[PDB]
Amino acid sequence: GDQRFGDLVFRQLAPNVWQHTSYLDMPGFGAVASNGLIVRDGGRVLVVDTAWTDDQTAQILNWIKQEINLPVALAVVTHAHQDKMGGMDALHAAGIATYANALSNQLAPQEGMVAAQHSLTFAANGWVEPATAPNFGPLKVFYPGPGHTSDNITVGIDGTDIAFGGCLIKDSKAKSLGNLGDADTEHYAASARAFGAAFPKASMIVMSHSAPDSRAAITHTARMADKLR
């Protein structure tokens, strides 16, 4: 069941995996939810995405202290928008090692974000170059191609049936692809399909702006993106 913790919501998805949710009252649209992940790997915790703000991200760390009570070894953030990187300063204040796509770190300042400490780079096939993602444990990082943004990355969780599409993927009942302001409309569909192909055994797809869904999230997202081309 959902756990309200201050202004955030936490939901256990699997034995060692929780979803964090935070909200930003954005004038013109409404109060927009964004989801990320928290993963326990043995005696440490790994975070995927910040909350929208530093204050909210500090609350994620407070929840982790209360409910898990193990050190956060690292965080990976999945592109240079506020929902994913808005809380970088809070992570740094906590002494957490941070990672993002090299391109996300490059784009961060102009997007109003603080860059992560470390840059991930990717092979031609999309898989992270392993030397750039040291000690990632069960986190398997994949660049699916440009879509929601040029820099969007995705994360599978080994030992689970979960893959995280971030803002690239919307659920199977979504009416649109959300914020396309920085999108690559020509490549979106192929990138969504590449995410699915990278994590073919994932049965639970987690994403930024929908609740967890089946792989129908991937097929529906790609089919909607076929219209963008």
Which residues make up each annotated binding site for Zn(2+)? 79, 81, 83, 148, 167, 209
DSSP 50-78: --SSHHHHHHHHHHHHHHT-S-EEEEEE-
- Mark 151-170 with x for binding to ligand OH (rule: CB under 6 A) and - for no binding: ----------------x---
| Rounded least distance, CB 125 to ligand OH, Å | 25
179 is an interface residue for ligand OH by CB under 6 A: yes
- AA letter at 109: P
How far lies 6's CA from each of 22, 30, 62, in Å? Answer: 10, 19, 10
Q: Which residues are annotated as a binding site?
A: 79, 81, 83, 148, 167, 170, 179, 209
Please give the structure tokens belonging to residue 195.
């995410």
| Closer of 16 and 50 to ligand OH (Cβ) | 50
81 is an interface residue for ligand OH by CB under 6 A: yes
Preceding-residue numbers of gaps in the chain (C–N over 2.5 Å): none
Q: Which does 105 bind (CB under 5 to 8 A by kind): ligand OH, Zn ion, none?
A: none
Q: What is the DSSP letter of 207?
A: -
80 is an interface residue for ligand OH by CB under 6 A: no
